[PDB]
Each structure stands twice: as structure tokens, then as C-alpha cells.
Enzyme design. Structure first.
Site, PDB file in Angstrom:
ATOM      1  N   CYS B 106      37.545  46.682  43.464  1.00 30.07           N
ATOM      2  CA  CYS B 106      36.523  45.784  43.616  1.00 30.07           C
ATOM      3  C   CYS B 106      35.800  45.551  42.089  1.00 30.07           C
ATOM      4  O   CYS B 106      35.175  46.541  41.817  1.00 30.07           O
ATOM      5  CB  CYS B 106      35.452  46.054  44.598  1.00 30.07           C
ATOM      6  SG  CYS B 106      34.263  44.596  44.858  1.00 30.07           S
ATOM      7  N   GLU B 283      40.446  34.114  41.987  1.00 27.92           N
ATOM      8  CA  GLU B 283      41.146  34.356  43.182  1.00 27.92           C
ATOM      9  C   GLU B 283      41.540  32.951  43.909  1.00 27.92           C
ATOM     10  O   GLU B 283      42.667  32.971  44.323  1.00 27.92           O
ATOM     11  CB  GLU B 283      40.015  35.139  44.222  1.00 27.92           C
ATOM     12  CG  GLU B 283      39.308  36.435  43.511  1.00 27.92           C
ATOM     13  CD  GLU B 283      38.491  36.807  44.561  1.00 27.92           C
ATOM     14  OE1 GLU B 283      38.777  37.993  45.212  1.00 27.92           O
ATOM     15  OE2 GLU B 283      37.286  36.428  44.546  1.00 27.92           O
TER      16      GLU B 283
HETATM   17  C1  HEM Z   1      29.676  39.772  45.826  1.00 25.78           C
HETATM   18  C2  HEM Z   1      30.670  39.179  45.104  1.00 25.78           C
HETATM   19  C3  HEM Z   1      32.106  39.940  44.961  1.00 25.78           C
HETATM   20  C4  HEM Z   1      33.201  39.652  44.169  1.00 25.78           C
HETATM   21  C5  HEM Z   1      32.884  38.926  42.826  1.00 25.78           C
HETATM   22  C6  HEM Z   1      34.053  40.549  44.453  1.00 25.78           C
HETATM   23  C7  HEM Z   1      35.358  40.679  43.875  1.00 25.78           C
HETATM   24  C8  HEM Z   1      36.476  41.299  44.165  1.00 25.78           C
HETATM   25  C9  HEM Z   1      37.715  41.002  43.739  1.00 25.78           C
HETATM   26  C10 HEM Z   1      38.357  39.745  42.846  1.00 25.78           C
HETATM   27  C11 HEM Z   1      38.778  41.803  44.519  1.00 25.78           C
HETATM   28  C12 HEM Z   1      40.507  41.901  44.462  1.00 25.78           C
HETATM   29  C13 HEM Z   1      40.636  40.526  44.940  1.00 25.78           C
HETATM   30  C14 HEM Z   1      42.242  40.411  45.581  1.00 25.78           C
HETATM   31  O1  HEM Z   1      42.503  41.461  46.276  1.00 25.78           O
HETATM   32  O2  HEM Z   1      42.794  39.762  45.070  1.00 25.78           O
HETATM   33  C15 HEM Z   1      37.992  42.672  45.181  1.00 25.78           C
HETATM   34  C16 HEM Z   1      38.449  43.535  46.007  1.00 25.78           C
HETATM   35  C17 HEM Z   1      37.498  44.464  47.086  1.00 25.78           C
HETATM   36  N1  HEM Z   1      36.146  44.358  47.192  1.00 25.78           N
HETATM   37 FE1  HEM Z   1      35.041  43.003  46.392  1.00 25.78          FE
HETATM   38  N2  HEM Z   1      33.839  41.546  45.650  1.00 25.78           N
HETATM   39  C18 HEM Z   1      32.384  41.075  45.858  1.00 25.78           C
HETATM   40  C19 HEM Z   1      31.945  41.674  46.999  1.00 25.78           C
HETATM   41  C20 HEM Z   1      31.952  42.504  47.955  1.00 25.78           C
HETATM   42  C21 HEM Z   1      31.623  43.327  49.047  1.00 25.78           C
HETATM   43  C22 HEM Z   1      30.209  42.678  49.501  1.00 25.78           C
HETATM   44  C23 HEM Z   1      32.337  44.119  49.435  1.00 25.78           C
HETATM   45  C24 HEM Z   1      31.998  45.121  50.614  1.00 25.78           C
HETATM   46  C25 HEM Z   1      31.075  45.249  51.626  1.00 25.78           C
HETATM   47  C26 HEM Z   1      33.531  44.382  48.626  1.00 25.78           C
HETATM   48  C27 HEM Z   1      34.605  45.252  48.788  1.00 25.78           C
HETATM   49  C28 HEM Z   1      35.892  45.173  48.582  1.00 25.78           C
HETATM   50  C29 HEM Z   1      36.876  45.825  48.880  1.00 25.78           C
HETATM   51  C30 HEM Z   1      37.046  46.894  49.981  1.00 25.78           C
HETATM   52  C31 HEM Z   1      38.058  45.467  47.964  1.00 25.78           C
HETATM   53  C32 HEM Z   1      39.663  45.922  48.012  1.00 25.78           C
HETATM   54  C33 HEM Z   1      40.358  45.107  49.156  1.00 25.78           C
HETATM   55  C34 HEM Z   1      41.705  45.606  49.228  1.00 25.78           C
HETATM   56  O3  HEM Z   1      42.111  46.539  48.397  1.00 25.78           O
HETATM   57  O4  HEM Z   1      42.651  45.007  49.948  1.00 25.78           O
HETATM   58  N3  HEM Z   1      33.432  43.239  47.647  1.00 25.78           N
HETATM   59  N4  HEM Z   1      36.705  42.335  44.870  1.00 25.78           N
HETATM   60  C1  8FD Z   2      45.298  38.562  48.129  1.00 21.74           C
HETATM   61  N1  8FD Z   2      45.206  39.931  48.104  1.00 21.74           N
HETATM   62  C2  8FD Z   2      46.111  40.802  49.024  1.00 21.74           C
HETATM   63  C3  8FD Z   2      47.545  40.629  48.188  1.00 21.74           C
HETATM   64  C4  8FD Z   2      45.749  42.051  49.346  1.00 21.74           C
HETATM   65  C5  8FD Z   2      44.539  42.475  50.223  1.00 21.74           C
HETATM   66  C6  8FD Z   2      44.752  42.649  51.449  1.00 21.74           C
HETATM   67  C7  8FD Z   2      43.728  43.090  52.347  1.00 21.74           C
HETATM   68  C8  8FD Z   2      43.737  43.163  53.472  1.00 21.74           C
HETATM   69  N2  8FD Z   2      43.740  43.455  54.626  1.00 21.74           N
HETATM   70  C9  8FD Z   2      42.419  42.396  52.027  1.00 21.74           C
HETATM   71  C10 8FD Z   2      42.251  42.181  50.495  1.00 21.74           C
HETATM   72  O1  8FD Z   2      41.076  41.803  50.229  1.00 21.74           O
HETATM   73  C11 8FD Z   2      40.707  41.592  48.775  1.00 21.74           C
HETATM   74  C12 8FD Z   2      39.295  41.009  49.003  1.00 21.74           C
HETATM   75  C13 8FD Z   2      38.161  41.848  49.601  1.00 21.74           C
HETATM   76  C14 8FD Z   2      36.810  41.407  49.640  1.00 21.74           C
HETATM   77  C15 8FD Z   2      36.595  40.475  48.847  1.00 21.74           C
HETATM   78  C16 8FD Z   2      35.117  40.188  48.810  1.00 21.74           C
HETATM   79  C17 8FD Z   2      34.250  40.547  49.560  1.00 21.74           C
HETATM   80  C18 8FD Z   2      34.660  39.103  47.899  1.00 21.74           C
HETATM   81  C19 8FD Z   2      35.742  38.576  47.019  1.00 21.74           C
HETATM   82  N3  8FD Z   2      35.241  37.645  46.151  1.00 21.74           N
HETATM   83  N4  8FD Z   2      36.774  39.141  46.998  1.00 21.74           N
HETATM   84  C20 8FD Z   2      37.449  39.847  47.938  1.00 21.74           C
HETATM   85  C21 8FD Z   2      38.812  40.278  47.858  1.00 21.74           C
HETATM   86  C22 8FD Z   2      43.356  41.954  49.822  1.00 21.74           C
END
Ligand code: HEM
Ligand code: 8FD
Ligand code: HEM
Ligand code: 8FD
Ligand code: H4B
Ligand code: H4B
Ligand code: CL
Ligand code: CL
Ligand code: GD
Ligand code: GD
Ligand code: ZN
Ligand code: ZN
Lengths: 404, 402
Positions: B106, B283
Site C-alpha cells: 500500500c 489503478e
Molecule cells: C485512502 C487511499 C488509498 C490509496 C490511494 C491506496 C493505494 C494503494 C494501491 C495503489 C495499492 C495497490 C493496488 C493494486 O493492487 O493494484 C494498495 C494496496 C493495498 N492497500 Fe491501500 N490505498 C488506500 C487506502 C487503504 C486502506 C484504507 C487500507 C486498509 C484499511 C489499505 C490497505 C491496503 C492493502 C492491504 C493492500 C494490498 C492488497 C493486496 O496485496 O492484494 N489501503 N493501496
Molecule cells: C489488481 N490487483 C490484483 C492483481 C491483486 C489484488 C488481489 C486482492 C485480493 N484479494 C486485492 C487487491 O487489492 C489491491 C488494493 C486493495 C485496497 C485498496 C484500497 C483500500 C484503496 C485503493 N485505492 N486501492 C486498493 C487496492 C489486489
């Protein structure tokens, strides 16, 4: 056997070659350090063991493994080390060594070419001037009036005791960098260090920001001396843009030949401190990292201003707009000058092709994702969505401490 | 003997001591790196739970105290009588934030300290579930001025089934398999679309049909639910100068609310705990619209821009993509829906690293995911070395219940 998947296509392969990896890298199960530029840091019983491995993959690589001349070559090498300590490679093995190490370079995206590499044996080199000629033939051969050809020149293997051969430039062709009463830099700030080491060796500073540095060569123990480069053999390309007519007048340019001269070639357990290689550029290296990196030439905002982009705000994406056109100008210029260049889309797709080849051949391929992926338009290219395994095979190109 | 981490753009050197606490083991060995992979009893619940209590009493500067030693003894005794234990009000808030803070992939974590925690641990059915969900979406969306939030449903427990949300996100678009062997709508959601329809849903025929919810209470089959049309905020995509762009009929939604990950806090696991922030333009622009397997509009857009699509060196792909991102950023600001571009995002992420280094002496970070999918080296996170590892509390993946 690691499960590696391509998420674009959905294909799945197992990397069996990773199992035959050797010298350990910086990662452990508690923390991944695969984004580190230098993996952590920098009675010889070792040599023999490393020597057999190489000889054996040599002969299995030409089928001639088991009995006959294969049986025979292993003993002469065992004899050679027993008496001398070090050993010498047959020239064919040296070529093999050079090539396999290009095949095993985890960060290199041009490895699809690894089967096509010219090897200039310079193991009989005995002087500082003798290196300089051996270099000039390389540059001329490799430049080939703009039709660039992959080439490497191996200088004699560092001996048990006594000094080694070593080029002092990071690359045979680099621009200078100058200080002032601002402490800033006119030129290429990445090469200020070596420019500093030049002037106090007798070199005279320059005018513009594209002064091709002078070579600083060095043979065993007798300290290095300068060698001025002939401007005919240093082919450059002035930078123009296919439709932005004002771009030429920025006075931008770059050299044809990417040729790196400070890395260490290791073959069969021997170390070559001086052994420079060359290929040809990928556009992004010039337009994106060399010209646009803040700690490099840093041309970005100037190009934006000429394009009348809105630099007041990041969300206008002026940075992305100017980068793309700077890259467009590199590809255009090099093709006008008829100098060999590859776009990052063509380069990456061929690297996919290279994986698929290596799979059938060696059941795997050491690849460093953080470097194969291009520094712009990453996700747009096929390597982005492809899972990779990074590890260390031998022979290989190793970094080494710089000799200043 | 802790990792030395360098920023190459400026020249900073810091050491990651936080990584030594890494309360788990990943896929990388000294023999090889697998950092690019997408997918990398009573006594044991005890050691994790005890660690979280120690965490929570530090964040409120009360470690080793009376209430702390009380809380420990209270917990380990309750696991002895019941097999598990319940979090208080305040601990749940702290654990939830700590899970965001620790999430390595994140880039928006600068904001982790501002998360609106909702407690739905009293939920009883699929209907109350929906009601907590509708309320989340309403608060978070906030008529365009977005707010970070998480809703926490009943923790996994012995003897009862699990609450699950079957959809990967609260808001998603349908994917219709065509006669041609093509897909209408979003191809990433073909599967969940299957389930909805076979569970009694009436299919549309559009490219942007907003999916129903499949919501499952313990030992119940999942139950279908339609989100009120006026609850889901959507943004028409147009371009500030390329006017033909709007005839593409493209839209995206305001609230990205991931609903299928597991929230682990001190040994308890909440299989249902949806959370939302706001979108980063890439995204939507690069990933959702340009990935060849998703909406795949890249070529179809360049052709309109009159680019030379017959060859790579014209960089037609890169040019199309940047104008698609531009269109996203423009359309969202025109509709006053919060959004963040990848330069601003990475920039603020670098503040977060400076903050975390002074606070916990380090920061878990996945380089391959932190670096935007276009324009990497332009951003300050490209030239910064990072250390990837796993701290708890944490958001984890988990299998699809079908
Ligand atoms: C508020 C604006 C936020 C932005 C701009 C942001 C941005 C991002 C982006 C761009 C990613 C990767 C996206 C992708 O997989 O293509 C990401 C991953 C992630 N974010 Fe955020 N995020 C935000 C809020 C949050 C919040 C509120 C949480 C938790 C309560 C969070 C938890 C996570 C987690 C757990 C991942 C990894 C998901 C995965 O590995 O599949 N984010 N974030
Ligand atoms: C397109 N990404 C996939 C290839 C990998 C992925 C898997 C899962 C799951 N389950 C969840 C994933 O979440 C990414 C994510 C999670 C949370 C986000 C929040 C809270 C905000 C934001 N702007 N982007 C997020 C992006 C990603
Ligand atoms: C012919 C076309 C070639 C192309 C397009 C190419 C491209 C690249 C690129 C983009 C990198 C990334 C390094 C950086 O960003 O500075 C790289 C690194 C590397 N290349 Fe290639 N290369 C080519 C030929 C060769 C040859 C001929 C050799 C050896 C004989 C080689 C061996 C290596 C090695 C060892 C590295 C790693 C450098 C490091 O670790 O810092 N490549 N190459
Ligand atoms: C800019 N990256 C640096 C910060 C890291 C680096 C270190 C060394 C060394 N030693 C050597 C390096 O050179 C990279 C390289 C080497 C060979 C190349 C060839 C043969 C062709 C090509 N197009 N690019 C290359 C690029 C880089
Ligand atoms: C910090 C980061 O790992 C490092 O600077 C790398 C990232 N990827 C790279 N990739 C290439 N091709 N060249 C580079 O110099 C870098 N730099
Ligand atoms: C295989 C590849 O590493 C994987 O698809 C990742 C790369 N980095 C990413 N980074 C972000 N932010 N989002 C992604 O979907 C991905 N995809
Ligand atoms: Cl370079
Ligand atoms: Cl999304
Ligand atoms: Gd003008
Ligand atoms: Gd227009
Ligand atoms: Zn690793
Ligand atoms: Zn993608």
C-alpha cells in the site's frame, strides 16, 4: 521447484535451474532485499571445485560429456592447478565462459542475443599502451559505423599475487562533470568522480556539458596513466525530435556505444578484473534514466516548459508527457543516424521469447524483475505481469571494488 | 546486522531494525528470491495474542502496567475456558489501523492514522450484514469527498460458520461471456458474475453493470442483494481536450472497497472486514482500463489519436496510456470525487517512510507494488531501496468460499 506464473496468459512453469544455483544472495525467509542494488556487499582450495563444474558444463554443452576427450581434459586441468596454483582456459572455453555469463546476468534484458557475442582474446596483454590498442579495435569493431555488434575484450587473468589489469572508467565513453562556486555540475554528474580523478592526472577541462572523458588505463602495479580518445572513433548522435522543431536547439546528444569497463568476469573459478563488454542501447536507458534522472542530466522540466505544459501541478502529468517525447526523440535520432537502438517494448517482448527458449533448454532462467521491467510504461510491457526467480549461476559478471 | 537501505536519488542511509521483529516467514531464501510472486492450537493463539496486547499498551504509553498485566491474565484465562477471546472497543480500533500501517503493498499508508473503524461484530444475519455494508458505502463515498473506513464483522469462532462477502469488492462491474468467446464488461469478474446469476440474479447486457452482493451468514447459503442505484457513485470518463473520448462510454466508480481479505488481530481472524480508501488514477487508468486482459482500450484509443500503431518505436502504447490517465484525473476532479495521482501519492509515501523510521525504526514495503505501473523512475520511490516483510496485525488473503 518454484511455481512461476504468467498472469497475462495464465501459463505456469517450474524453475528447476534455480535448484542448481550457487553463491547465496541477500534474501532470507524473514525479509526480502531483492531491491538492493548491491546484494549486501562486496591456501586456495576453492579453484579446483569451481574449475570442474565449468569444464563439465562445457562438455555436456557440446554433448561430448563422458569418456574420450572429456575424460582427458579434466586431468590436464587438475595437473595445471596442482603445479601452478592458477590454471589457463582453452580459448573455446573462454568463449563459452564469456557467453554463459551473459546468459546468466539476472538484470540484463537483452540476453536473447547471448548466442551472438564476439570474443576478443587479449590474455597475452603486457602493457598499458597494449590495453589501449586492444580497446580501440573493440570500439571500432563494436561501433561498425553505427551497425552495432555485441563484443567483449578479456584482458589477462589476475595472477596469484601481483597486480591486475583494470580499466578505471565505468564506461569507455562517458561525459565529464564540472564543479563551480555553486558546487553544481555542468555535464554528467554521475561521472564527476572519474572526471575528478582525470584532471589531477593531467587532463584539461572542457566547454559544454558533453565533453567525452579521456580513458584512464592501468596495467599491474605501475599506476594508471591517461589516454586521449580519437573523436572519429567516438560516434555520437545529436538529439532532434520528429515534429518538435525546437528540440534540436537544446544541444542534446548521446554516444552510440554502451560499453561497461569496471565489472569482473568470473569463469570456472578465475577472476578477470578488466574485461569490458558492449552491445547497443535500449532507448529508455538514454532518454529516461540518463537524461531525466534528477541526479543525472535532469532535463525534464525544460522540455515541459518548451511544450508549454502546466508544471504548476503534478496532476497535469507534465512529467509523463515530456518523458514520452524525450524518448521519442532518442529513438528517432538514432534511426536517422542509422545507429542501432531498441525500444523498450520490442526489447521486453524478446525477453519473453528468451524465457521460453531457456525453459526448454535449462529449465529456468535467473531474472531480476526490478530491472527487466522498463523504467517507464512498465505495466504496458509483457515482463510486468510475469513472475520471475532471481538467483546466482556461474559463470557470471560480478561487481568489484573500484581501484581508487 | 540489520539491512542497510539506501535512497539513491538523494543519498540517504538508514537501517531497518523493525524487520527483526518480522513475526512470520516468506518465500525468499539465500539461494533465490521470489519477491515477484503474487501469492508468496491453544498455546499458539496465546503467543500472538500476548504480542498484540503488548503492542496496544505501547501505543498508549502504558506498557507493563497494572491494566496491561490485568489484560494479559484476563485473556489467557479466557482462552482456557472458551478456546478464544474477545477484543475490547479500543483494541479493535488499534488493531485495524495497525493492519493498514503494516500492509507492504500500500502506497497510501501516510493516512493510516485516519481510519474510521466500524464495529459490526454484533451482526446476526445476511440482512443486517447488507445494512452495515450500505451504511459503510454511504459514509465512505460521502457525496464525493471520500473517507477511509473499515467495517468489522463477527470473528471466526469454533462451532459456527463464517461471515463471508463473496465479491472481491463491494462495487464491481459484470463480465458477460460472449458467443464469440469474448467478454462484455470487466473480464476479471466473469466468475463472481457466474455465481450471482446462478443464484437467481437477472443479468444485464451492459459493459458497466454494477454487480449484486453475495453475502453469507454462518452455515447459511449466500444471499443475493442489490445495491441501491443511488448509493453507488460513478464517474463518466472524458478528456479535457480529446472530445471524442467521451463517446467511448467509459465510466468508473468512486469507492474502491476491497471486501475479500482476512483481518488478523492478535490470533483472532475476521474473515469478513471490508475496507475502503480512495483511488489512485493509475489503478483505473493503467491497470483497470489498459491491462490486456481487463478492459483493453489501449489500442482502440491510440487508433483514435491517429497514432502509428503499426510499430512499437512510435511509442503509441505509452502515449495512449498517458492520455487515458489524464482523462481519469480530469473526469474525477470535474465530478469532485477525491482522487490522487501517482506523483503525489509516491511523494507522500516518502514522507511515511521518514515517519515510520523515527517511529518504529523501519517500514515493510514491497518495491514491485509500491512503484506505479507507469513512469516509475520519475517517482521518488523508484530509486529508494526497500525491505519486504510480514508484521501482525495484518490483512491476509484467503480462499474463495466456493
Ligand atoms: C485512502 C487511499 C488509498 C490509496 C490511494 C491506496 C493505494 C494503494 C494501491 C495503489 C495499492 C495497490 C493496488 C493494486 O493492487 O493494484 C494498495 C494496496 C493495498 N492497500 Fe491501500 N490505498 C488506500 C487506502 C487503504 C486502506 C484504507 C487500507 C486498509 C484499511 C489499505 C490497505 C491496503 C492493502 C492491504 C493492500 C494490498 C492488497 C493486496 O496485496 O492484494 N489501503 N493501496
Ligand atoms: C489488481 N490487483 C490484483 C492483481 C491483486 C489484488 C488481489 C486482492 C485480493 N484479494 C486485492 C487487491 O487489492 C489491491 C488494493 C486493495 C485496497 C485498496 C484500497 C483500500 C484503496 C485503493 N485505492 N486501492 C486498493 C487496492 C489486489
Ligand atoms: C545487445 C543488447 C543489450 C541490451 C539492449 C542490454 C540492456 C541492458 C539493460 C537495460 C540493463 C540494465 C542495467 C542498467 O539499467 O544500467 C543491462 C544490464 C546488464 N547487462 Fe545487458 N544489454 C545488452 C547487451 C549485453 C551484453 C553484450 C552483455 C555482456 C556481454 C550484457 C550483460 C549485462 C550485465 C552483466 C548487466 C548488469 C549490470 C549491473 O548489474 O549493474 N548485456 N543490460
Ligand atoms: C545505472 N545503473 C547503475 C546505478 C548500476 C550499474 C553498475 C555497474 C557496475 N559495476 C554497471 C552498470 O551498467 C549497466 C549496463 C551494463 C551493460 C549494458 C550493456 C552491455 C548494454 C546496455 N544497453 N546497457 C547496459 C547497462 C550499472
Ligand atoms: C532502488 C532500485 O532498486 C534501484 O535504483 C534500481 C531499480 N531498477 C532499476 N532498473 C534498471 N534497469 N536500472 C537501474 O538503475 C535500476 N535501479
Ligand atoms: C506479477 C506482477 O509482479 C504483479 O502482477 C504485480 C506487479 N506489481 C503490482 N503493483 C500494483 N500496485 N498492482 C498490481 O496489480 C501489481 N501487479
Ligand atoms: Cl548509460
Ligand atoms: Cl480496482
Ligand atoms: Gd510558445
Ligand atoms: Gd480537441
Ligand atoms: Zn527476495
Ligand atoms: Zn495489470
Amino acid at each position: 521447484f518454484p511455481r512461476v506464473k504468467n498472469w497475462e496468459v495464465g501459463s505456469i512453469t517450474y524453475d528447476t535451474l534455480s535448484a542448481q544455483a550457487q553463491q547465496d544472495g541477500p534474501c532470507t525467509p524473514r525479509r526480502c532485499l531483492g531491491s538492493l542494488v548491491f546484494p549486501r556487499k562486496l591456501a586456495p582450495e576453492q579453484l579446483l571445485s569451481q574449475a570442474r563444474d565449468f569444464i563439465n558444463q562445457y562438455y555436456s554443452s557440446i554433448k561430448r560429456s563422458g569418456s574420450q576427450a572429456h575424460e582427458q581434459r579434466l586431468q590436464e586441468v587438475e595437473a595445471e592447478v596442482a603445479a601452478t596454483g592458477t590454471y589457463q582456459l582453452r580459448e573455446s572455453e573462454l568463449v563459452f565462459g564469456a557467453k554463459q555469463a551473459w546468459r546468466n546476468a539476472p538484470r540484463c534484458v537483452g540476453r536473447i542475443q547471448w548466442g551472438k557475442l564476439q570474443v576478443f582474446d587479449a590474455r597475452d596483454c603486457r602493457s598499458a599502451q597494449e590495453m589501449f590498442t586492444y580497446i580501440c579495435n573493440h570500439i571500432k569493431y563494436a561501433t561498425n559505423r553505427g551497425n552495432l555488434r555485441s563484443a567483449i575484450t578479456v584482458f589477462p587473468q589476475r595472477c596469484p599475487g601481483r597486480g591486475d589489469f583494470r580499466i578505471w572508467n565505468s564506461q569507455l565513453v562517458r561525459y565529464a562533470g564540472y564543479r563551480q562556486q555553486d558546487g553544481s555540475v555542468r555535464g554528467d554528474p554521475a561521472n564527476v568522480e572519474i572526471t575528478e580523478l582525470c584532471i589531477q592526472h593531467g587532463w584539461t577541462p572542457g566547454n559544454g556539458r558533453f565533453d567525452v572523458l579521456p580513458l584512464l588505463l592501468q596495467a599491474p602495479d605501475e599506476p594508471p596513466e591517461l589516454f586521449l580518445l580519437p573523436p572519429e572513433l567516438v560516434l555520437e548522435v545529436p538529439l532532434e525530435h520528429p515534429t518538435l522543431e525546437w528540440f534540436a536547439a537544446l544541444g542534446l546528444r548521446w554516444y552510440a556505444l554502451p560499453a561497461v569497463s569496471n565489472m569482473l568476469l568470473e569463469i570456472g573459478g578465475l577472476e578477470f578484473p578488466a574485461a569490458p563488454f558492449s552491445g547497443w542501447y535500449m532507448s529508455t536507458e538514454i532518454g529516461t534514466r540518463n537524461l531525466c534522472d534528477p541526479h543525472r542530466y535532469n532535463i525534464l522540466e525544460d522540455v515541459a516548459v518548451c511544450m508549454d505544459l502546466d508544471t504548476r501541478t503534478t496532476s497535469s502529468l507534465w512529467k509523463d508527457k515530456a518523458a514520452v517525447e524525450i524518448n521519442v526523440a532518442v529513438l528517432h535520432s538514432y534511426q536517422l543516424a542509422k545507429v542501432t537502438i531498441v525500444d523498450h517494448h520490442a526489447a521486453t517482448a524478446s525477453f519473453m521469447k528468451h524465457l521460453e527458449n531457456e525453459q526448454k533448454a535449462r529449465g529456468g532462467c535467473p531474472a531480476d524483475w526490478a530491472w527487466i521491467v522498463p523504467p517507464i510504461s512498465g505495466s504496458l510491457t509483457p515482463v510486468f505481469h510475469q513472475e520471475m526467480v532471481n538467483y546466482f549461476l556461474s559463470p557470471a559478471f560480478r561487481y568489484q571494488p573500484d581501484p581508487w
